[PDB]
Amino acid sequence: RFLKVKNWETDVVLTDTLHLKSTLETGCTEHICMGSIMLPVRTKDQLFPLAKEFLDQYYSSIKRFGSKAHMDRLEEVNKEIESTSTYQLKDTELIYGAKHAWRNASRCVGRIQWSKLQVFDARDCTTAHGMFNYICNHVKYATNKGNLRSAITIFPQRTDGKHDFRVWNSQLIRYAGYKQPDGSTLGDPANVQFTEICIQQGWKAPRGRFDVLPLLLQANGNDPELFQIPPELVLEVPIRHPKFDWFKDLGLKWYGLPAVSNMLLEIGGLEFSACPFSGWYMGTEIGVRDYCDNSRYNILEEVAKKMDLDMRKTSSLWKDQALVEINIAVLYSFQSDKVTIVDHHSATESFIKHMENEYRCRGGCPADWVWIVPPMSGSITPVFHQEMLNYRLTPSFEYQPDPWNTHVWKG
Amino acid sequence: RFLKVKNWETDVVLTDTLHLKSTLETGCTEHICMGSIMLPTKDQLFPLAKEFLDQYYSSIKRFGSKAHMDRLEEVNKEIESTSTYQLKDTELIYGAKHAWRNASRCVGRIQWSKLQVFDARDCTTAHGMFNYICNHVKYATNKGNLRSAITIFPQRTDGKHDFRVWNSQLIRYAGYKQPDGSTLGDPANVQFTEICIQQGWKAPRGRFDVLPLLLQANGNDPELFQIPPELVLEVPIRHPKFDWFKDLGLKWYGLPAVSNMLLEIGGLEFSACPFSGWYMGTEIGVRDYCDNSRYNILEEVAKKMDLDMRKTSSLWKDQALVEINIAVLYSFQSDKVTIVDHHSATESFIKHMENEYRCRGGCPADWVWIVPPMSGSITPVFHQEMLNYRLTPSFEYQPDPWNTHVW
Ligand code: HEM
Ligand code: HEM
Ligand SMILES: Cc1cncn1-c1nccc(CCNCCCc2cccc(F)c2)n1
Ligand SMILES: Cc1cncn1-c1nccc(CCNCCCc2cccc(F)c2)n1
Ligand SMILES: C[C@H](O)[C@H](O)[C@H]1CNc2nc(N)[nH]c(=O)c2N1
Ligand SMILES: C[C@H](O)[C@H](O)[C@H]1CNc2nc(N)[nH]c(=O)c2N1
Ligand SMILES: [Zn+2]
Incomplete structure (x- = not known):
């Protein structure tokens, strides 16, 4: 069964077949959609099929499906599993695994980069x-x-979940x-x-x-x-605004390397509970969320004061106005110090391209719209107008x- | 099957039970979420009528009353006879108010029970x-x-009328x-x-x-x-800061009125049911003025602001988009024409959710549509989990x- 997604600004329609290779559940049913819900020690019993499925994917990507190298490897993993209840991935398998977990990260707008990931093997x-x-x-x-x-460092996989x-x-x-x-x-x-x-x-x-x-x-x-x-x-990068000179005087700085360290990398049934990975920041992560969420540095107030905005009514859009200026400063400061950064326009535009490319070559690109669309200026980015299908492929970041x-x- | 939604900015948690009444389907499955897809007989009719009438008579504290039983029988007979049936005025108003109450994409439902209904059957x-x-x-x-108002024309018959x-x-x-x-x-x-x-x-x-x-x-x-x-x-669009703004020749109408939907009540279908309310400011300034597939004036406005349109990095589109929306809100208020800004509206909706969870057991909402097309995360709905599902009566x-x- 084929499924089409339309872009309502360009009328470009794409067809998804990749969703057929999806196993894990979304959280949704025929009667309820939980697409805005943020969150909706493994036996040899179910391990080998997971192992086999991964390994089949792997050998197809290298154009060796059914090869002797393919079958022998399957046999080897099989025996190691029953003997030892688990198995070890070849370096080549781990690299492939990591790239793909990224590539299946439906919430990540940066996936266009997915092939260029430096993988460090800390096993x-x-x-x-x-x-x-x-x-x-x-x-x-x-x-x-x-x-x-881009880089990920991969520590030893879980064994019994006590180690x-x-x-x-x-x-x-x-x-x-x-x-x-x-x-x-x-x-x-x-x-x-x-x-x-x-x-x-x-x-x-x-x-x-x-x-x-x-x-x-x-x-x-x-x-x-x-x-x-x-x-x-x-x-670190000190934050200044290119027109407002009092901005430096807010004493704001941010670090340059965004790197997520609390996720779990699942490959072929194997669970890597320590797998910190790093890319580079899209400006809005710092400028909108880090600085302007009410439950974070919350500098909208203080920025808008110095801007002498009419803060007496929210219909003056002082908040929206300060938000943009803060985001302007963030991008300005990182480019000035030559620290890699991407703005939400550039990044969503590339994602659109990446996505089209993924439908053509892979038959789909799982994407989470709630997450892909940036947290300011939504509809003036092309992703806002892009229909997306969300589903879970392995390998995956959980x-x-x-x-x-x-x-x-212990003590 | 008793679900919970969380606001991640206030930690408020609400429990949803209303979903368990949901009749229609969503497009989603266990294996795929279609939350961002824009469009995912007498034996059919009577169970439909009964569900409606039951929930209607329950809403008036006469559930299982004689009046209730009477009406259920009365309608059952008319369907047997005429193959369709007609709604009492009371049912028609209740129905329409509730189709609005159930409209999961409408940020403005807090006003739902104050709907003027014009019967035009x-x-x-x-x-x-x-x-x-x-x-x-x-x-x-x-x-x-x-x-707010809706005018309702005769219901469908054989689809030819x-x-x-x-x-x-x-x-x-x-x-x-x-x-x-x-x-x-x-x-x-x-x-x-x-x-x-x-x-x-x-x-x-x-x-x-x-x-x-x-x-x-x-x-x-x-x-x-x-x-x-x-x-x-109509409202001539001027900016309270830029004198050149008026020269852009822009105006917009004050009454938004959706006229192409189908209102479904107790199984009956009203294919002509125009309704109107008032604009949330962004509807005009963000979507109408600045969508690429619409009036697309961002280029002209930033030029007029002398912003460096050389690189996306300058956020000139963002800068303009704000000012324009400042202007729209400014123009409407200056002409005493009702308009509401996205901060006030989303805030209102959060309150509406809290009431609905409290008084009804939940409120079906479509996040992809509720979050405004600008300044998404500085509005409270952004940080608010929402469950989406289709209750009836409904606008389809x-x-x-x-x-x-x-x-
Ligand atoms: C190199 C440039 C990259 C950019 C611009 C980028 C962009 C983003 C952004 C903006 C988010 C939203 C997260 C949030 O707001 O909480 C995200 C999520 C995510 N990204 Fe990336 N990313 C990049 C690299 C990577 C890499 C190298 C990986 C893995 C190898 C990755 C995997 C993920 C995952 C798993 C999520 C979801 C996180 C969560 O659900 O909490 N990304 N990405
Ligand atoms: C009175 C103040 C109101 C406000 C502020 C408001 C706001 C909104 C907004 C912003 C949307 C999204 C529109 C879009 O981007 O296409 C929407 C959709 C919708 N509204 Fe409201 N609305 C109001 C009144 C009403 C009334 C009176 C009704 C019905 C009686 C109604 C029913 C709906 C429905 C059914 C949708 C879904 C539209 C679609 O799916 O195309 N609204 N509303
Ligand atoms: C390094 C990186 C690569 N791609 C994205 N990042 C990145 N960098 C820096 C920060 C983040 C944030 C990741 N997401 C954080 C949200 C965590 C939560 C919190 C509450 C409920 C949830 F479902 C999930 N991502
Ligand atoms: C009067 C009113 C009350 N509530 C909202 N409005 C209102 N006023 C003015 C305009 C709109 C927009 C109505 N929805 C617009 C979307 C129509 C589409 C067009 C193409 C594909 C789709 F799935 C859907 N709504
Ligand atoms: C692709 C996506 O489903 C589509 O562009 C939606 C996104 N959210 C929206 N939200 C509102 N309020 N109105 C819309 O027309 C849309 N369009
Ligand atoms: C409830 C809501 O889904 C939640 O706040 C989401 C919305 N979209 C998001 N999008 C991104 N990129 N990051 C987030 O943390 C969130 N939070
Ligand atoms: Zn869904």
Whole structure:
């Protein structure tokens, strides 16, 4: 069965067959759509079929379906599974796996880059300290003095789920958030819970508005340990506006390397619970969400004051107006310091291209519209007008519970 | 099967049970979500009537009463007899108010129970339809103190006697294809502007020509009627900051009025049921003025602002888009014509959700449509999970009349 999606600004219709290779569930039924819901230790029993399915995909992509290399590998994985209850991926399989998890990330507007991903193989890692080293090399490589390169570092897979490798931070680089006794919050409010933990764990906190959190790494199911990323490795960018000179005086800065570290990488049934990955920022992530969400740095107020906007009525659109200026400053500042960044127009336009290309060559591109459309100026980006189908392919990046909620403390 | 929705900005959680009544289907499956797709007999009729009447009599605290039982029997008999049935006035108003209450794409449902309903099932001609519409337009406009309204024409019979308003909105601007390869006026309306001319309209071929009405009664060939100008309140668009703004020659009409939908109540189908409310500011400034497939004036406005349109990076489109929307809100308020901004509206809707979850057990909402086409994340609906599902009574889409009309 074929399914068509239309672009209502260009009248271009595309056909999806890829959705037929979808197994995992969406959360939706024939009677209910849960497309705006953010969130709607494995036996040998179900492992081999997952293994086989992945391996068939792999060998097709290399144009070796049915080959002797193909079947022998299937036989090998099979026997290793029954003997050992699990199996190990070839380097080639891991690389392919990682690329594809990205490529199936329906919520990621940046997937056009998916083939150029540097994959670091950290499957030989055994300690927290070993983890820190691997992570440091990731950051240094990825940052490349401001000319950012995509990368993922992949730690050992889950075995029995009692020996999980985890990176406790949600992102590698991120600012502390401190709740004050008067109820107010210093620094990033998203990070308050995690900051408190770090402190509890032994972190001495500078207690400022932009303190780079420490790494809290957990290896082989052991209690997590703290590490301070060498400051010289953490590229930061002071935020200024090109016309407004009082903007620098807001004392705002942001870090250059966005890197998500709390997801789970599933490949061929194997679960990699520590798989931090990094790309580069689309401006709105910082300019709209990081700075302007009410539950974050919330600088709309203070920016609009300095702009002398009529804040007396929301129908003056002072909020919308300050939002744009803040986003202008973010992009200006990153381009000035030559730190890689992309604006929401450029990025959604490329996604549209990427998407068309994916229908032509792959037979579809799973995309989550609620997530793909940027959080400001929606309809003046081409994705707004683009119909999208959302479905789950493997390999895949999945959410996983916060480790402080699940961890078994040794002592 | 008792679902929960979360606001991720306030941590408020609501529990949804209303979904368990949902009858119609969504387009989605366990394997695929179609949330961003724009369009995913006596034995049929009576169960339909019963469900409606049951929920109606429950709404008036006479569930299982004699009056309830009486009516259920009365209608059952009329269906057996006439194959269709007719609604009591009370049921008709309840029905229409609730189709609005159930419209998962409408950010403005907080006002749902204050809907003026004009019963027009006694109508028989297009001239007659014109008179009903004119009255609706005058009442709703109310010299700019806009009031919500719907006018309902006879229900469908055998599908050959369908009443229809061919216009997509009662009041809209013509669109003309130029020899220039370009498009003067409203591109959304180019084809309709044709058909008007084909049926005989004499187009002044301006940019903002109010389209004529093209009304269809009892399945007859449709007729043209020009709305009295004195009933079409318009707003000249000026900016409270840029004096050059007026020179762009822009204006917009004050009464938004969807006329091409099908209203379904207790199994009956009203193919002609124009309704109107008031504009959320972005509807005009973002979509109407700035969609590429519409008036597409962003280029002209940024030029007039002398912004560096050289690179997307400057966010000149974003900068202009704001100012334009500041202007639209400014113009309407300066003329005492009701309009609401996206912050006030989305905020209102959040309140409406809280009431509905409280008093009804839920409220079906379509996130992809509720979040405004600008400044998405600085409005509260953005951070609000919504469950989407189809309750009845309902407004459904229907084919454009030209494609169907037996001539
Ligand atoms: C290189 C430039 C990239 C850009 C511009 C980009 C852009 C984005 C953006 C804007 C989001 C929205 C996330 C949010 O607002 O919470 C997102 C989500 C996502 N991206 Fe990317 N991305 C890039 C690279 C990557 C890479 C290298 C990977 C993996 C290897 C990836 C995988 C994902 C995944 C799994 C999500 C969903 C995250 C979630 O659901 O919380 N992206 N992407
Ligand atoms: C009174 C203030 C109202 C406001 C502020 C409002 C706002 C909106 C908005 C912004 C949309 C999305 C429109 C689009 O982008 O196409 C919408 C859709 C809709 N509205 Fe309302 N509306 C109002 C009144 C009404 C009334 C009186 C009714 C019916 C009696 C109604 C029923 C609907 C329906 C059925 C849709 C879906 C449109 C579609 O699917 O094409 N609304 N509304
Ligand atoms: C490094 C990267 C590559 N692609 C995107 N990113 C990126 N960088 C920096 C930050 C983020 C944010 C990722 N998403 C964070 C949202 C996490 C949540 C929180 C509550 C409910 C949910 F379903 C999900 N993504
Ligand atoms: C009067 C009113 C009350 N509530 C909203 N409106 C209102 N006024 C003026 C305009 C509109 C827009 C109606 N919806 C427009 C979408 C029509 C389409 C066109 C192509 C494909 C689709 F799926 C759907 N709504
Ligand atoms: C592609 C997407 O489904 C389509 O463009 C939708 C998106 N959201 C919308 N939201 C509103 N309010 N009105 C619209 O016309 C649309 N269009
Ligand atoms: C409830 C709602 O779906 C939720 O807030 C989503 C909306 N879309 C989003 N889109 C992106 N890119 N990132 C987000 O965190 C969200 N949040
Ligand atoms: Zn869905």
